[PDB]
Design a protein around this ligand. Structure first.
Ligand SMILES: Cc1cc2nc3c(=O)[nH]c(=O)nc-3n(C[C@H](O)[C@H](O)[C@H](O)COP(=O)(O)O)c2cc1C
Length: 362
């Protein structure tokens, strides 16, 4: 077994390969998108993870697309995250903050001034986001058609990522994960389906990756490359954003460019929740030889599959999502081949302690 053996991940060392995937749970305080003590307890319960990757966290107020998702841009958000990372470290854990901008996957009613959200192009996501009703309960709402970013607004987006990473360092996170997956802003630029720009940020794959690579360079400079990870979902379709007709070649281009920056890790979200075709070993070999940091695999993995691919040398760690919602001590359970708690999907999003902190440990 290798799942239970250490792994150097940039500036930290994970004691095992069983990672907690980033999981939006929509339990933050509003007004203010503020992490809560309850959220602190949830992450503390899961601190035996080789690495915790947080729920997607806004880099700015504009970044917001979901009611109840936290930010890492205001003083109160920084103060509250500081308590959460402290609790994880008190339990000898490690935690990364996943940083996003939701772009078009958003609604005007939670944007600053209530105006339309922004994207690479003015194309509706044709999906839904999660808002809150007048009783604070989560509800689904159709996404608002976005406004295309002006060329002269793109430096500000890069700066907002940079500032969020500086805030993350102050808040005590061990690493940051850039959310370049799942149809959110960075992926909206990467994909030809969502990006119809005719300036240097659209068209060729070089142009489409331009923004994500500017963001990587800016956050490596702000902190250090050995603190930066990135999540991509470059094969298949996610939230109606596909990766285009040259998805494999374009993915390897981006991965080669990321490797030049020396970053801590590449986290691949392999399929969305509704399924997709599995990665070939050949494509995994092509990724592996292009990236010389840690590679994390995710998407309906089992322990068996993770052991197989780590033993084949194709990935280094696995991130589990839903099994970590339901099993705070997933590591111990996998080590002992104990049974898992059953999942209660009706309480994945929103709500309070029920379905969040009441899944027992062994
Ligand atoms: C409730 C829920 C919330 C999620 N939130 C995020 C998120 O905030 N960021 C992200 O990159 N992926 C998110 N995901 C995708 C998961 O991180 C993970 O890749 C996915 O659940 C597939 O793995 P699994 O079968 O182990 O759950 C979420 C998935 C679920 C079910």
């Amino acid at each position: 077994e290798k799942l239970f053996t250490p792994l150097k991940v940039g500036a930290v060392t994970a004691p095992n390969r069983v990672f907690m995937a980033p999981l939006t749970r929509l339990r933050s305080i509003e007004p203010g998108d503020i992490p809560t003590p309850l959220m602190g307890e949830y992450y503390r319960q899961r601190a035996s993870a080789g690495l915790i990757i947080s729920e997607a966290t806004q880099i700015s107020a504009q970044a917001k697309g979901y009611a109840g998702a936290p930010g890492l841009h205001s003083p109160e958000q920084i103060a509250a995250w500081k308590k959460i990372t402290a609790g994880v470290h008190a339990e000898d854990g490690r935690i990364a903050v996943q940083l996003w901008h939701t772009g078009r996957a958003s609604h005007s009613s939670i944007q600053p001034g209530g105006q339309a959200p922004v994207s690479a192009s003015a194309l509706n996501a044709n999906t839904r986001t999660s808002l809150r009703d007048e009783n604070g309960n989560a509800i689904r709402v159709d996404t608002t058609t976005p406004r295309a970013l002006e060329l002269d607004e793109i430096p500000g987006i890069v700066n907002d990522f940079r500032q969020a990473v500086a805030n993350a360092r102050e808040a005590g996170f061990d690493l940051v994960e850039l959310h370049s997956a799942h149809g959110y802003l960075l992926h909206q630029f990467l994909s030809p389906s969502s990006n119809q720009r005719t300036d240097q940020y659209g068209g060729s794959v070089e142009n489409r990756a331009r923004l994500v690579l500017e963001v990587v360079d800016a956050v490596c400079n702000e902190w250090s490359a050995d603190r930066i990870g990135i999540r991509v979902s470059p094969i298949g379709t996610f939230q109606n954003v596909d990766n285009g007709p040259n998805e494999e070649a374009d993915a390897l281009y981006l991965i080669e460019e990321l490797a030049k920056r020396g970053i801590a890790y590449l986290h691949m979200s392999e399929t969305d929740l509704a399924g997709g075709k599995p990665y070939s070993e050949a494509f995994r070999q092509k990724v592996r030889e292009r990236f010389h940091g840690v590679i994390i695999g995710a998407g309906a993995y089992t322990a068996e599959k993770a052991e197989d691919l780590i033993g084949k040398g194709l990935i280094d760690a696995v991130a589990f999502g839903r099994d970590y919602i339901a099993n705070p001590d997933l590591v111990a359970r996998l080590q002992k081949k104990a049974e898992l708690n059953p999942q209660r999907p009706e309480s994945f999003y929103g709500g309070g302690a029920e379905g969040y902190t009441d899944y027992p440990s062994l």
